[PDB]
């Protein structure tokens, strides 16, 4: 039921949060470790594609558990505009 899924989302962050709070920023320039509310992201290497685990709060998790959300990091080290959501979602 919706209530349960929602509570689970509420957990997936406040987890991403404390990791991010535990995590100390890289030496060189990198995209901020941050919570976009959908997936949780690592600090990203400069000018690289960041890989994220398929979120667990997401139903149909286990199908996609191994999968990744690919999101590119800027030249600057600014987080890019768009996300690549697949391996994390394919219920069919």
């Amino acid at each position, epitope marked *: 039921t919706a209530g349960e899924l929602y509570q*689970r*989302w*509420e957990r997936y962050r406040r987890e991403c949060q404390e990791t991010l709070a535990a995590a100390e920023p890289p030496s060189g320039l990198a995209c901020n470790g941050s919570f976009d*509310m*959908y997936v949780c992201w690592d600090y990203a290497a400069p000018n690289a594609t960041a890989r994220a685990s398929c979120p667990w*709060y997401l139903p*149909w998790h286990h199908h996609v558990a191994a999968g990744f959300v690919l999101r590119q990091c800027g030249s600057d080290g600014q987080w890019g505009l768009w996300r690549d959501h697949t391996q*994390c979602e394919n*219920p069919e």
Partner: antibody
Amino acid sequence: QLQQSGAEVKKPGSSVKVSCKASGGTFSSYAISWVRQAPGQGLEWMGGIIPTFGTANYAQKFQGRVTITADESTSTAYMELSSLRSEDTAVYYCAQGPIVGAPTDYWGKGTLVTVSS
Amino acid sequence: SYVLTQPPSASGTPGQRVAISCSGSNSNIGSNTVHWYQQLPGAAPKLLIYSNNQRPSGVPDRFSGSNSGTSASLAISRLQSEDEADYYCAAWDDSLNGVVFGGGTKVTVLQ
């Protein structure tokens, strides 16, 4: 970030189906929620659905009035309201989000539905 | 059918703190985290604070969320002109299904 259907004028006791048209890709993954606002008043939640997953969610008091569904291809999620009313005269926004109960950072322009005889 | 935002309106002076309280019952705010939306005249709602005082991209630390034990609170701690708007707090409800909003609060700056 979603283009909605555009304004509608309808007589009471009738039915209107307004569309929320999303990104050609990146659609099925997130919850789509519909919120309405009567001119001059506050927000009212209606329901939400993860387009490609399970059944739509609703709030009580719309009972047998609102049907929220979604289409695979057109990557659009429509919603239908029956037994129309003056209290249904409003503007209808579709906000994208992570899950159904969760908050929404992405809204639409909204589609105004005016209802009078 | 409403968690009451306490306030139909609330006033404020530029460079001062303005607080908007939102009361509830224990199936809504008591049992979950409160959100906050900012709507501007002629505009759609805009996410201000989600999940008990966390914030989305590009939202200054000016805004802050409160406990949710009985009623929550939004605090805009240094006011501006572009801060006059409708403010709708929101929470999920355990007792009766989906999310519920507040009556909203139009905030005022002084000319």
